[PDB]
Amino acid sequence: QVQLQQPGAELVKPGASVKLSCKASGYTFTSDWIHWVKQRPGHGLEWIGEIIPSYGRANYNEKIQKKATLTADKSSSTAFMQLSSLTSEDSAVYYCARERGDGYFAVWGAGTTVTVSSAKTTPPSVYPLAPGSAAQTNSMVTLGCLVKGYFPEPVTVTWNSGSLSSGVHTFPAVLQSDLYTLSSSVTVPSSSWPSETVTCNVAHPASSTKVDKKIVPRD
Amino acid sequence: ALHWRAAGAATVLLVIVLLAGSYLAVLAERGAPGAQLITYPRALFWSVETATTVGYGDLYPVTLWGRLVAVVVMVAGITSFGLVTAALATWFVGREQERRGHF
Amino acid sequence: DILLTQSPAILSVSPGERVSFSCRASQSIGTDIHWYQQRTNGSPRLLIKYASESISGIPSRFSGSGSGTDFTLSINSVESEDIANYYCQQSNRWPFTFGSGTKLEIKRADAAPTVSIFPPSSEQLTSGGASVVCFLNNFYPKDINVKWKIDGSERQNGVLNSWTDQDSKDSTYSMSSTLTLTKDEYERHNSYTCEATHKTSTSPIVKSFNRN
Ligand SMILES: CCCCCCCCCO
Ligand SMILES: [K+]
Ligand SMILES: [K+]
Ligand SMILES: [K+]
Ligand SMILES: [K+]
Ligand SMILES: [K+]
């Protein structure tokens, strides 16, 4: 029951534009304000603008350059932000937030990762990472999952569809030749493998793809 | 009863003005740097202390349309109080000429 | 407008110790300040609205105070899940502004890295490429060095590293070194070793695999 639903990611050519969305479930009062917050990687929160869907009026941040245009559709309960004439400086994560008109942001969206580059969309390549057949196992055996050659960010990785939540490290991606490379690790008991099945779920929203990979011990 | 029609309608009008005025004040004040009348709960109290002409100064509009809304809230509260006071006076007068023997 | 200054940028604290972040406004804003929490790769989460009032679902561990130009968010007995970025936001005047932010880090006990080396998979070798992945999981502190050696000889070309933030499950750090090579380059060599020097060991912890 995500109150504010946003697309995963968006790829925009330099100089082009994109229309971000924020579908709103839950209670929708006539006093609701939809705010949009920009956040760069490794940076803080920046307020872009607000809009009241019941009236259609929008305000913006005067201290920065007007790259956004806020609209709304009351029939579908979805606010829109039009980012036009994008450069590399506009590549960030854009959240949408609902304010009940009392000052604070009660609920946030998942955020949309907007990437502005001339490179093309490439689906990820998932490779199993099983330990060597001559490696020793303690009471815990660490398994991995290799995700390389994708563009652009991000990618989501789960182990056994989330049931293996504890003991998971997903390392930040590395950019090389307009391509990203990511690795993820999972720590399961040595008795839980290869007895129980372990699978990494890699989803690339920018290419609308999602694949799994069973970690089978090396022959 | 004409005096109870005018007083009864004015009070209903006042309630509509107080609620809409609180809503329209926030809508008109946001977008103006420095404005403090930008949240509905305290804007609801601002409309009351405006219609009753108390006007502490803790909250006030700074924009044109915020001030136009304030004027409407001022006039609504004042005229409603003038009609109710008038309606009470005629009610007491008519009640006073009764009890004696005048109908 | 109203600028919100957050101090300090990074805040180190021992487990089970009461900590306090500071948010300060350019001018008096009464009590119209709000606190948010943002974990790694996550969305902001409201913890405290209007300086001191609490939020349902947020533990009683969190509490806020202050008025005017000095606001404080306190955490009684900090635990690992508190490791995140904390922001303050004012709603007293238009427009709403945010603070610069404060990162929380926990000074826990030193932990040795768990090194793990992985041979290139068959799905990758059947495409003219090979990547030996070396994981270094759950170590404290964050300072650590990685070293690759092919057949005894040290290798540096083709190695990309990736460090995580302080994991909010046990207050530890992780690192992944990846040596990417071609299929032909991987075949004409034998032993691949991954070394790890850390503060908790004068001797570098190593892991090695043999493709035979
Ligand atoms: C009646 C409320 C209308 C408020 C419109 C404010 C527009 C200000 C533009 O600068
Ligand atoms: K008065
Ligand atoms: K007064
Ligand atoms: K006064
Ligand atoms: K005063
Ligand atoms: K004063």
Side-chain angles (χ1 to χ4, degrees), chain C residues 196-198 200-206:
Chain C
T197 302
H198 182 239
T200 55
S201 179
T202 57
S203 302
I205 300 182
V206 309

Side-chain angles (χ1 to χ4, degrees), chain B residues 49 53-57:
Chain B
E49 63 158 310
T53 73
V54 173
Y56 288 124

Side-chain angles (χ1 to χ4, degrees), chain B residues 83-96:
Chain B
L83 290 164
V84 171
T85 301
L88 290 167
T90 77
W91 178 38
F92 298 157
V93 158
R95 192 64 163 260
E96 181 59 25

Side-chain angles (χ1 to χ4, degrees), chain B residues 31-36 38 42, chain C residues 32 50 91-96:
Chain B
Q36 296 180 163
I38 56 177
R42 60 188 60 179
Chain C
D32 306 317
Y50 288 93
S91 62
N92 184 271
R93 296 179 174 272
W94 196 92
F96 298 164

Side-chain angles (χ1 to χ4, degrees), chain A residues 33 47 50 57 59 62 99 103, chain B residues 24-40 42-43 46 57-67, chain C residues 1-2 27-29 32 90-97:
Chain A
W33 289 81
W47 188 79
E50 58 187 348
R57 189 175 181 273
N59 303 317
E62 304 174 348
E99 179 227 358
Chain B
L24 292 174
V26 178
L27 183 65
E29 290 292 293
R30 289 197 183 186
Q36 296 180 163
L37 191 61
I38 56 177
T39 49
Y40 303 110
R42 60 188 60 179
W46 162 84
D58 54 342
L59 298 164
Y60 50 87
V62 302
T63 62
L64 172 59
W65 288 102
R67 280 163 175 166
Chain C
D1 61 338
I2 302 176
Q27 48 185 303
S28 177
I29 60 173
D32 306 317
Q90 66 90 13
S91 62
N92 184 271
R93 296 179 174 272
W94 196 92
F96 298 164
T97 59

Side-chain angles (χ1 to χ4, degrees), chain A residues 1-22 24-62 64-73 75-88 90-119 121-135 137-164 167-176 179-218:
Chain A
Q1 211 210 341
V2 179
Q3 311 288 269
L4 268 52
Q5 301 180 8
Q6 307 181 255
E10 291 287 337
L11 176 64
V12 189
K13 289 291 185 178
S17 61
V18 68
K19 191 181 188 64
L20 300 187
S21 64
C22 176
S25 62
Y27 281 153
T28 59
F29 297 95
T30 179
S31 63
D32 287 335
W33 289 81
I34 298 300
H35 303 248
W36 288 87
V37 177
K38 174 185 178 179
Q39 184 183 37
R40 281 180 172 175
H43 291 63
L45 303 182
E46 179 183 0
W47 188 79
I48 298 183
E50 58 187 348
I51 185 177
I52 170 168
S54 65
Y55 196 90
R57 189 175 181 273
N59 303 317
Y60 299 93
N61 192 333
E62 304 174 348
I64 65 178
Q65 182 175 0
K66 268 208 59 181
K67 291 292 183 177
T69 295
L70 301 185
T71 52
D73 182 274
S75 57
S76 56
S77 302
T78 305
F80 299 94
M81 177 175 65
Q82 180 67 30
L83 299 176
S84 57
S85 302
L86 298 185
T87 68
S88 62
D90 298 319
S91 298
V93 175
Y94 295 88
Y95 297 92
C96 64
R98 172 194 295 168
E99 179 227 358
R100 294 304 192 189
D102 42 20
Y104 54 90
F105 298 152
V107 54
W108 293 72
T112 299
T113 302
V114 175
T115 302
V116 178
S117 181
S118 302
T121 305
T122 54
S125 302
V126 178
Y127 295 145
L129 291 187
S133 57
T137 53
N138 198 43
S139 61
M140 303 292 180
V141 45
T142 294
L143 304 166
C145 190
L146 176 62
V147 184
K148 62 177 283 78
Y150 71 85
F151 194 86
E153 302 261 41
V155 276
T156 304
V157 164
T158 69
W159 288 94
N160 280 5
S161 302
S163 71
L164 243 46
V168 164
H169 303 159
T170 299
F171 301 91
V174 179
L175 182 60
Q176 179 184 8
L179 289 177
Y180 288 101
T181 298
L182 178 139
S183 296
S184 180
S185 68
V186 57
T187 301
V188 305
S190 296
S191 62
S192 304
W193 191 73
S195 56
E196 283 71 18
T197 168
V198 287
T199 53
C200 52
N201 315 91
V202 180
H204 192 244
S207 61
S208 303
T209 55
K210 178 180 180 180
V211 293
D212 302 330
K213 181 55 66 62
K214 170 64 182 297
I215 305 300
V216 193
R218 307 174 64 92

